[PDB]
Amino acid sequence: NANVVVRLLIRRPECFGPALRGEGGNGLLAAMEEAIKIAEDPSRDGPS
Amino acid sequence: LSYGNGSLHVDAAFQQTLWSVAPISSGSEAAQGYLIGGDVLRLLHGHMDECLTVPSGEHGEEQRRTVHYEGGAVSVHARSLWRLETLRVAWSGSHIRWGQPFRLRHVTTGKYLSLMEDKNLLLMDKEKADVKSTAFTFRSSKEKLDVGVRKEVDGMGTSEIKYGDSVCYIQHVDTGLWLTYQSVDSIQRKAIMHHEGHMDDGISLSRSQHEESRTARVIWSTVFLFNRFIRGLDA
């Protein structure tokens, strides 16, 4: 199962997310600091 | 194929690219002793076997750009090597036939043989080597009548030019002129492009060894890089 799942995920790279798409990817660490900033800001975190 | 980068690049990525395979040649079907596309050869001339070459390594590229007939150890040197290139990508390794246009490339200098408007043979570069200027053709006889245009076979084809035995005449595709010696004078006799041509303009074809062809290509690719290095250091 793991070998099939990894192959499908790498076949469709968009499943990883904007940080790990590959082009213009800030990276996992940068995405997590961006998430911290979003969680700190009220407007981005909530529907407002 | 990575489109996003400013310069197109090939790399192994998760996104897929469609690749088409074009058959260049088949090794088994190749006939021994017959000219095929992409061969490094020497244009032997006269019964003394003077080879068509460029001036020796006197460091002047504008001086190297000239073409002349010369005899001696140049027939054993790597300065008299020409690679025949057909004007078609698919089946580029097929047997060459009488009347098929091709391009002659000087292996050492990386320049293509061509004809200027003033009826002179001068070597110029890939960027400005047009088909009309750089098109040449082997003709069996000095006969004015031509074969026109014929359908191209999608295969190795039939053998029509044989190394050594066959006698060929270089004729420019568009101008219809014939390559010949200037006859005015080691010998350093000039080669000039003439529509009548002399009564002795036969050319013999001698194939070059793989080791020598590889060495000539290495020489060209090394002198290019070292010239870039020298220019950078000078700047």
- How far does Cα B138 stand from its chain's mean position? 12
Taking the C-alpha atoms of residue B42 and residue B51, their distance in angstroms, rounded to an integer, is 6
Rounded to a whole number of angstroms, the distance between the first and last alpha carbons of chain A is: 42
Q: Are B14 and A11 an interchain contact pair (Cβ–Cβ within 8 Å)?
A: yes
Taking the C-alpha atoms of residue A43 and residue A40, their distance in angstroms, rounded to an integer, is 9
Resolution in A: 3.1
Taking the C-alpha atoms of residue B26 and residue B154, their distance in angstroms, rounded to an integer, is 12
Provide the experimental method for this PDB entry. cryo-EM
Residue closest to B37 by CA, chosen among B83, B78, B79, B82: B83
Kindly list the residues from chain A whose CB atom is less than 8 angstroms away from the CB atom of residue B15.
13
Three-state secondary structure call for residue A22: coil
Distance of residue B22 Cα from the nearest chain A Cα, in angstroms: 27
**Contact at 8 Å (CB) between B71 and B187?**
yes
Token reading at A36:
């911290």
Q: How far is CA B5 from CA B10, B63, B151, B204, in A?
A: 11, 40, 40, 48
- How far does Cα B65 stand from its chain's mean position? 14
Cα three-residue angle B96-B192-B185, rounded to 5 degrees: 130
Token reading at B7:
């310069």
Query: What are the E-state strand segments in chain B?
Result: 40-45, 50-53, 68-70, 82-86, 102-106, 111-112, 136-139, 169-172, 178-181, 189-194, 203-207
A23 interfacial to chain B (CB closer than 8 Å): yes
Q: Are A13 and B4 an interchain contact pair (Cβ–Cβ within 8 Å)?
A: no
A10 interfacial to chain B (CB closer than 8 Å): yes
Q: Are A23 and B14 an interchain contact pair (Cβ–Cβ within 8 Å)?
A: no
Burial of residue B167 (number of CB atoms within 10 Å: 0-12, 13-18, 19+): middle
Closest chain B residue by Cα to residue A24 = B4
B15 interfacial to chain A (CB closer than 8 Å): yes
**Contact at 8 Å (CB) between B206 and B44?**
yes
